[PDB]
């Protein structure tokens, strides 16, 4: 049993065991307010002392208090009831008060437990659940969108896993060109759908082609279809993982000039570089990439052409001065530099593409032994 | 000003103020266990009485309790500490105790807050976090796949909000047909882009789509582009809301930037370009090569043979062609251009073999060297 | 003998039998130049008609033509001489003439075999051989340098084919970590040297980590040595084809803890981190930023502007840069990120202006909010 | 402007102009052989006379000949065609024939230009072309392999010419040790990078030291870097040229130097606006930056190093358990809203991201803490 306890100590024990306690007199006025030294931002509850209980509790709460305390006699029994404080700045959440009728002056000691912790954690859980709701809804929305766009599209596309080399999706057009209904090609290793090809080397061909960004397609023969097909690859990172999207056209299917020009670009031995008026590379063909030992078009796109010229600023100054003077630089000799400090012999020619908004540069770069 | 109370009433007040409380002797023995009758049960803890406190605490909590409480003095303050109990039924449960040391016998009175509800919500919080992460990742994947498929597709497509009538998405092909860029066409009113006779005639088709989920494909005229187009509409449901997906066909039968700039290089470039058949018979030539060979017209040298322009003649033809037909590319070839009138020119030629099943082509890039 | 022929027929037979032929008067004046339409262009040499032959010859060719012509008499057979003509400005072209003296004029008929296709070819070929010998010496040198640098290096390296997945080269150090003689590992599929890996998924791990440039290496177990190893990929392009370079280190074997921890927060942390120049030019970014922005690689965004990834675009970067430039710090800058495929990701950026008097730096911690 | 020429003189002109000229009736029989006089070795081709012009031609050349012949008009022009004969050997030899059909007898006069020397030249030139291109590709691949294996290798290396003593190549690692950029050190005397060394004595030192099997690293002082370094030499021959290879290491393995990224990260931590905390697996703090200290009204980093994260979280233990139990599972936690403790029993709203840094004996927790007050 508890030893000899003094009233001071008892007041402290109650003040630390409960979160807030009130000694309300028999007449309904608050005589003593015992807040917790360990409860957040307290000691500012001193106002309640001397005030009636109706200035500290909502009306309904006062009513519940009255009702539970109607028959509450001293010495035999105690009762628990949830009451709410008016000021949410003191106690935003309801308090579980355990009521005792005191023997001497028939005052009532209210011992309170703040629901605040449990309530705020559980509210956090509710918040989380609603967030998850909107999350799955948006996920399903975008899923439907991607589905409709891929299926409706008249452009034959196939999505291949960069880790497995197997088809993860496609549309009915790609299936038509390949010779299998969508269900049959799902999961089928793409490289095996083409005669004479293997996973490793075919994926390497696709991936390198994508990095180059050449529009020169890979000629393939579909096993099921026996159709000569052309495959144009693109690599993209979705949610941190890389995927491979192939566009497929069948082969054998005026204006020959533009065609042959594009072919000159993607297949030509001379490097060609398009660039803003300040040398900023906008695009370049496979030849310039191979020449510079560049990992990919995207790697150089956005950089200054000076990063690949041996003289650096001097070369860029010459290009710009000539091309801005006569519109043309005929033959300029310098060295191309790779990002591993290599040096190639190069001869450059260049032309200003007369524009009001986007003045371009087209540079023909030739490897000269 | 709290009135003095009988030790029994004090006992009951302490037991009801806390959710659970323990009275522990100085030497560490649990002397009494006090339950809050208005609080959810902890089990029959009455067995604890007369037994050492460490028997009902985890090892971590034993060490904690000992570290926190030993410094405690009567009336010199109290300490808070979270402890994990072991019930007689071998289960565990957390409590946040406030420790006081009593003047009479230096015993420790432990005033606890129940931590069971909070831990309960905590597990669910952990699970929720995991789910939110996986959901977010799946979202990102699907949205990226959508945007990539849309951008890449050569089928000109436009996505219109049925609710607002404004363009909600599109690709650069539909941009090329409409006569603008994604950023500019984005948000545009659809009836002000697809034009027929009588202003916003397209809104009639919109009306048909709103109640049918489909409509007969319509001939319109791209406002920005002044191109005669043909629009195939259909409606689906994403996230409950309805969205129009339009396909676009040019009524007649769209060159991108690269084709135009390559054309610019051909006609305005300094280096000569010559296209010929496998016979070396010239199919096409650019103005650089024309001004290089003092040729009057593109039409005058078209059909002629490459040999009539190369110093070594038949030899040069055969070497260029037979070399590229093996490698596909010839990096640098030095020769001379024979001129109809002027002196022959010192040239350097690169060559590429553009293979084809039907009409193979040789392409030459011809440079004047001093 | 042969059937008698009209004068015109005779002229055309002579003209087509020779590659080119000159009729030079007794005095030395070129009366007529007869071209072979079946034979590659010489240019228009009809402008020699009227001038003396000696002015379209070299000095040596002049003396030689004198020597062969002066003795030549009508009906006394024919002789041969090789002359070099001189181009307008100022090249040359060699013809092998056979000289006849006509009994009617005492003029000289010169019948030409074209030497342009043949001239100086052989000398060129000798030069090509010598050039090849030199090239070969250089190759030998570079080969030895490569071997010595690879083998002597204390950095365990393995070169892997991207098309076959097999090891094409490695040093003795890598050979020690892998637990195999060089001759056993040469040609071996790299994946199968590590427990629980396959060619496809492993090559994807390596390629992707190389593109990411994260210093967070891949843990593997070497099959032969049974040692835990750490691998760091490198992908380069050599002569048009791609290669994989692997740096290997033992997992159980730098001076600063805070520095390593920070390195790890960077390469492995969830928040996107970008270091840029004062003008917004991206100097670096972590894997998290690449993943948030759907960027293929660190290389693809390096050198480019932060504004490329802001939805507001330029104006956004203006407000951000200026704010952080004066204020020094910015705790919650709310905007929208973009991807190369026109996405819009809500995000919250915290920016710090690392103030250096020479080259100031801008660091952004980027967080995907919803 | 051709004079009146005698018929046999014309026959001679045609004979000497061309290399070998054939007359053949409309049927296809070799009437006469008019080989070039100045080429005496063609004299034996006369045996073709009396034979059809197909026992001395290839079938392809036969076809071509037939077509081009039946195409021509007599007294309207001519036509060139490449044919292949059968010489006195088994060889086939090419000739550019110019077909003129005579209005005299409908017979065809063939005017032959020997195409052999041109042919030989074509094959030789093509062979040379292809050879040089392949050689180029080979060179480029090998040189590139070399370049990257050198650049990437963390083993700091300098390659010196034995003949000149000048640095011919190196890598970034070595450059960092010497205190120079790549382009500053190329061509430089190697001896003049190390404080108080002369060429000759240095080259002989390195050579002799290389000759020693149980060698010892030579401590040197890099002139630019001012670093004490250790140099280990290996001498090898490369294509008749002696080269010196130098592996370099710092004499002090303590100082790690670090790179630009390390620097930048340090500046991010010490000076950045976000709070950053590294704790152990149980959440006791190992390190915290100034922003976190200011965020929580902490007195110092010393005064909170060793405390649990829960000491600064409003809801305490639960927030910690949620964070840790979450990242241990996922690896990363993107965003966790919560509340921090500030002085005078105060609080501020905060968004924490978490990342679990795995390890075998020291798993680490990292939190990037944002004040979202």
PDB file of C-alpha atoms in Angstrom, chain C residues 25-179:
ATOM      1  CA  UNK C  25      49.518  22.187-139.846  1.00  0.00           C
ATOM      2  CA  UNK C  26      52.990  21.840-141.322  1.00  0.00           C
ATOM      3  CA  UNK C  27      53.890  25.120-139.613  1.00  0.00           C
ATOM      4  CA  UNK C  28      52.833  24.114-136.095  1.00  0.00           C
ATOM      5  CA  UNK C  29      49.312  25.518-135.889  1.00  0.00           C
ATOM      6  CA  UNK C  30      46.473  23.376-134.532  1.00  0.00           C
ATOM      7  CA  UNK C  31      44.029  23.254-137.450  1.00  0.00           C
ATOM      8  CA  UNK C  32      41.494  20.954-135.821  1.00  0.00           C
ATOM      9  CA  UNK C  33      40.771  19.120-132.571  1.00  0.00           C
ATOM     10  CA  UNK C  34      38.756  15.920-132.897  1.00  0.00           C
ATOM     11  CA  UNK C  35      37.162  14.523-129.739  1.00  0.00           C
ATOM     12  CA  UNK C  36      35.769  11.055-129.054  1.00  0.00           C
ATOM     13  CA  UNK C  37      32.184  11.421-127.741  1.00  0.00           C
ATOM     14  CA  UNK C  38      32.460   7.845-126.477  1.00  0.00           C
ATOM     15  CA  UNK C  39      35.516   8.866-124.472  1.00  0.00           C
ATOM     16  CA  UNK C  40      35.356  10.876-121.174  1.00  0.00           C
ATOM     17  CA  UNK C  41      35.467  14.677-121.413  1.00  0.00           C
ATOM     18  CA  UNK C  42      38.742  16.562-121.802  1.00  0.00           C
ATOM     19  CA  UNK C  43      36.837  19.801-121.691  1.00  0.00           C
ATOM     20  CA  UNK C  44      36.341  21.852-124.850  1.00  0.00           C
ATOM     21  CA  UNK C  45      39.669  21.697-126.686  1.00  0.00           C
ATOM     22  CA  UNK C  46      38.162  23.266-129.794  1.00  0.00           C
ATOM     23  CA  UNK C  47      39.687  26.504-128.474  1.00  0.00           C
ATOM     24  CA  UNK C  48      43.143  25.188-129.351  1.00  0.00           C
ATOM     25  CA  UNK C  49      42.117  25.450-132.999  1.00  0.00           C
ATOM     26  CA  UNK C  50      43.919  28.500-134.366  1.00  0.00           C
ATOM     27  CA  UNK C  51      46.831  28.653-131.923  1.00  0.00           C
ATOM     28  CA  UNK C  52      50.265  27.016-132.243  1.00  0.00           C
ATOM     29  CA  UNK C  53      50.622  23.553-130.708  1.00  0.00           C
ATOM     30  CA  UNK C  54      53.666  24.581-128.677  1.00  0.00           C
ATOM     31  CA  UNK C  55      51.692  26.896-126.382  1.00  0.00           C
ATOM     32  CA  UNK C  56      49.467  24.069-125.137  1.00  0.00           C
ATOM     33  CA  UNK C  57      52.447  21.803-124.469  1.00  0.00           C
ATOM     34  CA  UNK C  58      55.049  21.682-121.702  1.00  0.00           C
ATOM     35  CA  UNK C  59      58.644  22.600-122.586  1.00  0.00           C
ATOM     36  CA  UNK C  60      59.789  18.973-122.511  1.00  0.00           C
ATOM     37  CA  UNK C  61      56.761  17.953-124.576  1.00  0.00           C
ATOM     38  CA  UNK C  62      57.711  20.735-127.010  1.00  0.00           C
ATOM     39  CA  UNK C  63      61.283  19.495-127.470  1.00  0.00           C
ATOM     40  CA  UNK C  64      60.069  15.883-127.742  1.00  0.00           C
ATOM     41  CA  UNK C  65      57.413  16.737-130.342  1.00  0.00           C
ATOM     42  CA  UNK C  66      60.091  18.590-132.320  1.00  0.00           C
ATOM     43  CA  UNK C  67      62.415  15.576-132.178  1.00  0.00           C
ATOM     44  CA  UNK C  68      59.761  13.087-133.299  1.00  0.00           C
ATOM     45  CA  UNK C  69      58.111  15.320-135.913  1.00  0.00           C
ATOM     46  CA  UNK C  70      61.181  16.739-137.660  1.00  0.00           C
ATOM     47  CA  UNK C  71      62.423  13.339-138.826  1.00  0.00           C
ATOM     48  CA  UNK C  72      58.982  11.969-139.667  1.00  0.00           C
ATOM     49  CA  UNK C  73      58.232  11.712-143.397  1.00  0.00           C
ATOM     50  CA  UNK C  74      55.040  10.960-145.410  1.00  0.00           C
ATOM     51  CA  UNK C  75      54.509   7.247-146.055  1.00  0.00           C
ATOM     52  CA  UNK C  76      57.403   6.322-143.762  1.00  0.00           C
ATOM     53  CA  UNK C  77      55.175   4.711-141.156  1.00  0.00           C
ATOM     54  CA  UNK C  78      54.496   6.491-137.876  1.00  0.00           C
ATOM     55  CA  UNK C  79      56.150   7.296-134.542  1.00  0.00           C
ATOM     56  CA  UNK C  80      55.042   7.636-130.925  1.00  0.00           C
ATOM     57  CA  UNK C  81      55.646  10.274-128.267  1.00  0.00           C
ATOM     58  CA  UNK C  82      54.186  11.161-124.877  1.00  0.00           C
ATOM     59  CA  UNK C  83      53.329  14.814-124.425  1.00  0.00           C
ATOM     60  CA  UNK C  84      51.874  16.685-121.473  1.00  0.00           C
ATOM     61  CA  UNK C  85      49.323  19.343-122.388  1.00  0.00           C
ATOM     62  CA  UNK C  86      48.793  22.366-120.148  1.00  0.00           C
ATOM     63  CA  UNK C  87      45.438  23.307-118.590  1.00  0.00           C
ATOM     64  CA  UNK C  88      44.158  26.946-118.663  1.00  0.00           C
ATOM     65  CA  UNK C  89      45.090  27.488-115.000  1.00  0.00           C
ATOM     66  CA  UNK C  90      47.255  25.677-114.514  1.00  0.00           C
ATOM     67  CA  UNK C  91      47.179  21.881-114.398  1.00  0.00           C
ATOM     68  CA  UNK C  92      48.306  19.239-116.893  1.00  0.00           C
ATOM     69  CA  UNK C  93      47.081  16.067-118.588  1.00  0.00           C
ATOM     70  CA  UNK C  94      49.171  13.432-120.424  1.00  0.00           C
ATOM     71  CA  UNK C  95      48.420  12.001-123.873  1.00  0.00           C
ATOM     72  CA  UNK C  96      50.258   9.311-125.794  1.00  0.00           C
ATOM     73  CA  UNK C  97      50.296  10.403-129.427  1.00  0.00           C
ATOM     74  CA  UNK C  98      51.147   8.476-132.560  1.00  0.00           C
ATOM     75  CA  UNK C  99      52.392  10.863-135.232  1.00  0.00           C
ATOM     76  CA  UNK C 100      51.606  10.540-138.931  1.00  0.00           C
ATOM     77  CA  UNK C 101      52.758  12.957-141.599  1.00  0.00           C
ATOM     78  CA  UNK C 102      50.143  13.375-144.326  1.00  0.00           C
ATOM     79  CA  UNK C 103      51.467  13.382-147.919  1.00  0.00           C
ATOM     80  CA  UNK C 104      48.974  16.053-148.953  1.00  0.00           C
ATOM     81  CA  UNK C 105      49.855  18.883-146.536  1.00  0.00           C
ATOM     82  CA  UNK C 106      53.062  17.769-144.848  1.00  0.00           C
ATOM     83  CA  UNK C 107      50.884  18.543-141.822  1.00  0.00           C
ATOM     84  CA  UNK C 108      50.920  16.304-138.764  1.00  0.00           C
ATOM     85  CA  UNK C 109      48.108  14.028-137.690  1.00  0.00           C
ATOM     86  CA  UNK C 110      48.361  13.183-133.982  1.00  0.00           C
ATOM     87  CA  UNK C 111      46.407  10.194-132.664  1.00  0.00           C
ATOM     88  CA  UNK C 112      45.916  10.247-128.915  1.00  0.00           C
ATOM     89  CA  UNK C 113      45.637   7.630-126.223  1.00  0.00           C
ATOM     90  CA  UNK C 114      44.398   9.131-122.956  1.00  0.00           C
ATOM     91  CA  UNK C 115      46.800   8.723-120.026  1.00  0.00           C
ATOM     92  CA  UNK C 116      44.793  10.583-117.326  1.00  0.00           C
ATOM     93  CA  UNK C 117      43.242   7.397-115.909  1.00  0.00           C
ATOM     94  CA  UNK C 118      46.700   5.856-115.556  1.00  0.00           C
ATOM     95  CA  UNK C 119      49.046   8.763-114.740  1.00  0.00           C
ATOM     96  CA  UNK C 120      50.992   8.766-111.458  1.00  0.00           C
ATOM     97  CA  UNK C 121      48.864   5.900-110.103  1.00  0.00           C
ATOM     98  CA  UNK C 122      51.816   3.579-109.519  1.00  0.00           C
ATOM     99  CA  UNK C 123      53.844   6.195-107.638  1.00  0.00           C
ATOM    100  CA  UNK C 124      50.767   6.711-105.484  1.00  0.00           C
ATOM    101  CA  UNK C 125      50.686   2.988-104.732  1.00  0.00           C
ATOM    102  CA  UNK C 126      54.342   2.898-103.703  1.00  0.00           C
ATOM    103  CA  UNK C 127      53.591   5.831-101.391  1.00  0.00           C
ATOM    104  CA  UNK C 128      50.567   3.950-100.020  1.00  0.00           C
ATOM    105  CA  UNK C 129      52.738   0.993 -99.126  1.00  0.00           C
ATOM    106  CA  UNK C 130      55.273   3.175 -97.314  1.00  0.00           C
ATOM    107  CA  UNK C 131      52.437   4.971 -95.521  1.00  0.00           C
ATOM    108  CA  UNK C 132      51.089   1.548 -94.530  1.00  0.00           C
ATOM    109  CA  UNK C 133      54.456   0.479 -93.089  1.00  0.00           C
ATOM    110  CA  UNK C 134      54.506   3.635 -90.981  1.00  0.00           C
ATOM    111  CA  UNK C 135      50.899   3.159 -89.858  1.00  0.00           C
ATOM    112  CA  UNK C 136      51.898  -0.359 -88.880  1.00  0.00           C
ATOM    113  CA  UNK C 137      54.794   0.830 -86.724  1.00  0.00           C
ATOM    114  CA  UNK C 138      52.456   3.227 -84.936  1.00  0.00           C
ATOM    115  CA  UNK C 139      49.929   0.433 -84.394  1.00  0.00           C
ATOM    116  CA  UNK C 140      52.648  -1.742 -82.893  1.00  0.00           C
ATOM    117  CA  UNK C 141      53.657   1.063 -80.537  1.00  0.00           C
ATOM    118  CA  UNK C 142      50.103   1.866 -79.393  1.00  0.00           C
ATOM    119  CA  UNK C 143      49.446  -1.859 -78.959  1.00  0.00           C
ATOM    120  CA  UNK C 144      52.434  -2.272 -76.635  1.00  0.00           C
ATOM    121  CA  UNK C 145      51.455   0.873 -74.693  1.00  0.00           C
ATOM    122  CA  UNK C 146      47.932  -0.495 -74.243  1.00  0.00           C
ATOM    123  CA  UNK C 147      49.183  -3.880 -73.053  1.00  0.00           C
ATOM    124  CA  UNK C 148      51.683  -2.417 -70.583  1.00  0.00           C
ATOM    125  CA  UNK C 149      49.237   0.154 -69.191  1.00  0.00           C
ATOM    126  CA  UNK C 150      46.474  -2.416 -68.758  1.00  0.00           C
ATOM    127  CA  UNK C 151      48.656  -5.175 -67.257  1.00  0.00           C
ATOM    128  CA  UNK C 152      50.829  -3.029 -64.951  1.00  0.00           C
ATOM    129  CA  UNK C 153      47.800  -1.123 -63.606  1.00  0.00           C
ATOM    130  CA  UNK C 154      46.912  -1.898 -59.984  1.00  0.00           C
ATOM    131  CA  UNK C 155      43.311  -1.004 -60.846  1.00  0.00           C
ATOM    132  CA  UNK C 156      41.432  -4.268 -61.554  1.00  0.00           C
ATOM    133  CA  UNK C 157      39.862  -3.795 -64.984  1.00  0.00           C
ATOM    134  CA  UNK C 158      37.792  -5.973 -67.307  1.00  0.00           C
ATOM    135  CA  UNK C 159      36.787  -5.065 -70.878  1.00  0.00           C
ATOM    136  CA  UNK C 160      33.480  -6.601 -71.910  1.00  0.00           C
ATOM    137  CA  UNK C 161      31.871  -6.862 -75.333  1.00  0.00           C
ATOM    138  CA  UNK C 162      28.429  -5.240 -75.572  1.00  0.00           C
ATOM    139  CA  UNK C 163      27.240  -7.601 -78.302  1.00  0.00           C
ATOM    140  CA  UNK C 164      28.453 -10.916 -76.898  1.00  0.00           C
ATOM    141  CA  UNK C 165      28.672 -10.091 -73.188  1.00  0.00           C
ATOM    142  CA  UNK C 166      31.994 -11.901 -73.158  1.00  0.00           C
ATOM    143  CA  UNK C 167      35.245 -10.636 -71.681  1.00  0.00           C
ATOM    144  CA  UNK C 168      37.539  -9.379 -74.452  1.00  0.00           C
ATOM    145  CA  UNK C 169      40.419  -8.313 -72.190  1.00  0.00           C
ATOM    146  CA  UNK C 170      41.458  -7.880 -68.550  1.00  0.00           C
ATOM    147  CA  UNK C 171      44.541  -7.375 -66.349  1.00  0.00           C
ATOM    148  CA  UNK C 172      46.193  -9.764 -63.881  1.00  0.00           C
ATOM    149  CA  UNK C 173      44.652  -7.793 -60.994  1.00  0.00           C
ATOM    150  CA  UNK C 174      41.074  -8.325 -62.154  1.00  0.00           C
ATOM    151  CA  UNK C 175      42.168 -11.901 -62.825  1.00  0.00           C
ATOM    152  CA  UNK C 176      43.154 -12.246 -59.182  1.00  0.00           C
ATOM    153  CA  UNK C 177      39.880 -10.830 -57.858  1.00  0.00           C
ATOM    154  CA  UNK C 178      37.822 -13.049 -60.201  1.00  0.00           C
ATOM    155  CA  UNK C 179      39.963 -16.034 -59.262  1.00  0.00           C
TER     156      UNK C 179
END
